[PDB]
Amino acid sequence: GSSGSSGKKTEWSREEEEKLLHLAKLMPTQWRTIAPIIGRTAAQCLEHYEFLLDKAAQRDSGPSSG
C-alpha cells in the first residue's frame, strides 16, 4: 500500500553517481561499506550502480571498440 508521491522512492544525483562509480569500482564487493560511505543502502548502491552501467551503454553515444 503506497502512493505515487515522494517518500519510499529515492532519486540519485550527479554527485551521488560520480562517487558511486568511484567506490563501486574501488570495492565492488564491499557494498556494505560503500553504502554508509555514500548515504544509500548496499542494495540501493548496487541496484543504482548497475543500472548506470546499462544506462550509459544505451546512450546514443557510440561505444569505444576496446
PDB file of C-alpha atoms in Angstrom:
ATOM      1  CA  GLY A   1       0.000   0.000   0.000  1.00  0.00           C
ATOM      2  CA  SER A   2       1.597   3.211  -1.244  1.00  0.00           C
ATOM      3  CA  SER A   3       1.049   6.313  -3.376  1.00  0.00           C
ATOM      4  CA  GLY A   4       2.769   7.927  -6.344  1.00  0.00           C
ATOM      5  CA  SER A   5       4.373  10.516  -4.077  1.00  0.00           C
ATOM      6  CA  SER A   6       7.811  11.202  -2.601  1.00  0.00           C
ATOM      7  CA  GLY A   7       8.910   9.125   0.375  1.00  0.00           C
ATOM      8  CA  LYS A   8       9.723   5.459  -0.183  1.00  0.00           C
ATOM      9  CA  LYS A   9      11.379   6.108  -3.545  1.00  0.00           C
ATOM     10  CA  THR A  10      14.806   7.742  -3.779  1.00  0.00           C
ATOM     11  CA  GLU A  11      16.274   9.613  -6.746  1.00  0.00           C
ATOM     12  CA  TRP A  12      20.055   9.847  -7.089  1.00  0.00           C
ATOM     13  CA  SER A  13      22.023  12.923  -8.154  1.00  0.00           C
ATOM     14  CA  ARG A  14      25.056  13.543 -10.363  1.00  0.00           C
ATOM     15  CA  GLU A  15      27.066  13.821  -7.145  1.00  0.00           C
ATOM     16  CA  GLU A  16      25.790  10.560  -5.658  1.00  0.00           C
ATOM     17  CA  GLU A  17      26.525   8.897  -9.000  1.00  0.00           C
ATOM     18  CA  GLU A  18      30.045  10.178  -9.662  1.00  0.00           C
ATOM     19  CA  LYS A  19      31.088   8.997  -6.199  1.00  0.00           C
ATOM     20  CA  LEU A  20      29.189   5.750  -6.772  1.00  0.00           C
ATOM     21  CA  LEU A  21      31.125   4.837  -9.916  1.00  0.00           C
ATOM     22  CA  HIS A  22      34.334   5.526  -7.991  1.00  0.00           C
ATOM     23  CA  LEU A  23      33.535   3.487  -4.880  1.00  0.00           C
ATOM     24  CA  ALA A  24      31.772   0.673  -6.734  1.00  0.00           C
ATOM     25  CA  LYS A  25      34.947   0.232  -8.780  1.00  0.00           C
ATOM     26  CA  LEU A  26      37.201   0.534  -5.730  1.00  0.00           C
ATOM     27  CA  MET A  27      35.356  -2.148  -3.763  1.00  0.00           C
ATOM     28  CA  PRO A  28      32.704  -3.929  -5.873  1.00  0.00           C
ATOM     29  CA  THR A  29      32.437  -6.496  -3.079  1.00  0.00           C
ATOM     30  CA  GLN A  30      32.162  -4.044  -0.184  1.00  0.00           C
ATOM     31  CA  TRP A  31      28.690  -2.622  -0.803  1.00  0.00           C
ATOM     32  CA  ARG A  32      28.050  -2.952   2.932  1.00  0.00           C
ATOM     33  CA  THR A  33      30.828  -0.389   3.365  1.00  0.00           C
ATOM     34  CA  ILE A  34      30.137   1.849   0.371  1.00  0.00           C
ATOM     35  CA  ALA A  35      26.502   2.174   1.438  1.00  0.00           C
ATOM     36  CA  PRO A  36      27.304   4.086   4.654  1.00  0.00           C
ATOM     37  CA  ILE A  37      30.109   5.857   2.795  1.00  0.00           C
ATOM     38  CA  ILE A  38      27.719   7.277   0.201  1.00  0.00           C
ATOM     39  CA  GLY A  39      24.485   7.559   2.158  1.00  0.00           C
ATOM     40  CA  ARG A  40      22.335   4.912   0.489  1.00  0.00           C
ATOM     41  CA  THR A  41      21.945   1.250   1.440  1.00  0.00           C
ATOM     42  CA  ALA A  42      24.013  -1.582  -0.028  1.00  0.00           C
ATOM     43  CA  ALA A  43      21.102  -2.728  -2.189  1.00  0.00           C
ATOM     44  CA  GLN A  44      20.361   0.840  -3.276  1.00  0.00           C
ATOM     45  CA  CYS A  45      24.000   1.473  -4.185  1.00  0.00           C
ATOM     46  CA  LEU A  46      24.407  -1.768  -6.135  1.00  0.00           C
ATOM     47  CA  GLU A  47      20.967  -1.510  -7.737  1.00  0.00           C
ATOM     48  CA  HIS A  48      21.563   2.081  -8.845  1.00  0.00           C
ATOM     49  CA  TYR A  49      25.184   1.495  -9.852  1.00  0.00           C
ATOM     50  CA  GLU A  50      24.461  -1.483 -12.105  1.00  0.00           C
ATOM     51  CA  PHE A  51      21.574   0.482 -13.614  1.00  0.00           C
ATOM     52  CA  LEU A  52      24.030   3.230 -14.554  1.00  0.00           C
ATOM     53  CA  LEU A  53      26.322   0.868 -16.461  1.00  0.00           C
ATOM     54  CA  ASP A  54      23.429  -0.181 -18.698  1.00  0.00           C
ATOM     55  CA  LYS A  55      22.028   3.349 -18.923  1.00  0.00           C
ATOM     56  CA  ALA A  56      25.388   4.578 -20.211  1.00  0.00           C
ATOM     57  CA  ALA A  57      25.562   1.930 -22.936  1.00  0.00           C
ATOM     58  CA  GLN A  58      22.064   2.767 -24.171  1.00  0.00           C
ATOM     59  CA  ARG A  59      23.103   6.408 -24.537  1.00  0.00           C
ATOM     60  CA  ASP A  60      23.194   7.256 -28.244  1.00  0.00           C
ATOM     61  CA  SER A  61      26.905   7.979 -27.828  1.00  0.00           C
ATOM     62  CA  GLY A  62      28.605   5.107 -29.629  1.00  0.00           C
ATOM     63  CA  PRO A  63      30.910   2.835 -27.600  1.00  0.00           C
ATOM     64  CA  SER A  64      34.699   2.779 -27.938  1.00  0.00           C
ATOM     65  CA  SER A  65      35.702  -0.505 -29.573  1.00  0.00           C
ATOM     66  CA  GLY A  66      38.011  -1.852 -26.884  1.00  0.00           C
TER      67      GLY A  66
END
